Amino acid sequence: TVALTVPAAALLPDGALGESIVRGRRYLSDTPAQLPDFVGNGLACRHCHPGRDGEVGTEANAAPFVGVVGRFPQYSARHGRLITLEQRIGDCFERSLNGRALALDHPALIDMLAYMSWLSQGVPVGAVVAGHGIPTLTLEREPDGVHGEALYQARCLACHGADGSGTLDADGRYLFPPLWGPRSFNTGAGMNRQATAAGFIKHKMLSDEEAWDVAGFVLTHPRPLF
C-alpha cells in the first residue's frame, strides 16, 4: 500500500479547478441542503466518510476518498460489470442517501470528482491507500440484539437518540445522524450489512463483541426499502 496523506488546502490552485474542488467539498459535507433533488434522507456523504478540518473522506477505515480515483473503473458485482467512479457515487446517492443518482456529466458530480481527485493528489494510479474502505468485522456467532440494545443505551443513545433519529444542529443539518427510520440510509446501502456496520462502528468510535452486538441491534430496525 501507500500511505494516506491529506493535501494542504492552502495550496489549492486559483482558477476553475480550485473553485470546483471547493464546491465539491461542500456537496460532500452538506449534501441534503446543496442537492435536494437528489437526496431522499437526512444524510450527507460526510456522515459515513468523515474528515478533519472541514475535509470529507480523509479518515482511515472510514472509507476515505484519498486515492479513490485511481481505483476506478472497477468491477461491481451488483452491476455485473465494470463501473466508473461517477456510477459508484450515483449508487451511494440511491442507497446511502435514499435518493436519485446525478447525471454522469452533472456539474455537481464533476465538482465532487474534482475534490476526490484533489484528495488523491500524488497517489499512483492503481495503488491502494492504507486505510481505504471500511474493514469488515465478523464474529463467529450471531449478533446479540439484546446485548446490543443495552450497549446502545449506554454508548450511543446520547448522540443518536432513543429512536435512532439523530440530533439536528441549529442550521438543520444533522450533528449526529439518524441510524434507522425514514431519514436514515436505505436497505440497499452497504451500511445495512452487519459486518460493514460492525466494522464501521468498531473503527469510528468498543470491544469486537460489543461492536458486533450493537451493530446487530441497530440493524433490527426499519429503514426505507430500496
Q: Which of 1, 159, 222, 226 binds ligand HEC (CB under 6 A)?
A: 159
What gap in Å lies between CA 179 and CA 103, rounded to an integer?
28
Is 45 part of any known ligand binding site?
Answer: yes
What gap in Å lies between CA 40 and CA 188, rounded to an integer?
13
Site for ligand HEC in 114-153 (CB under 6 A): 132-134
What is the nearest approach in angstroms of ligand HEC to the Cβ of residue 102?
9
Query: Which residues on adjacent β-strands are paired with residue 75?
Result: 82
Query: With binding defined as CB under 6 A, does residue 113 bind ligand HEC?
Result: no
What residues contact 165, with CB distance under 8 A and at least 6 apart? Answer: 178, 181, 183
Q: Which of 106, 147, 155, 203 binds ligand HEC (CB under 6 A)?
A: 155
What gap in Å lies between CA 116 and CA 56, rounded to an integer?
9
What residues contact 117, with CB distance under 8 A and at least 6 apart? Answer: 69
Site for ligand HEC in 43-82 (CB under 6 A): 43, 45, 47-50, 63, 68, 71
How many angstroms separate the Cα of 49 from the Cα of each of 28, 52, 150, 208, 215? 9, 10, 27, 21, 18
What is the nearest approach in angstroms of ligand HEC to the Cβ of residue 226?
12
Q: List residues binding ligand HEC (CB under 6 A).
A: 28, 31, 43, 45, 47-50, 63, 68, 71, 85, 88-89, 92-93, 96-97, 112, 132-134, 155-156, 158-160, 176-179, 184-185, 189-191, 196-197, 200-201, 204-206, 214, 218
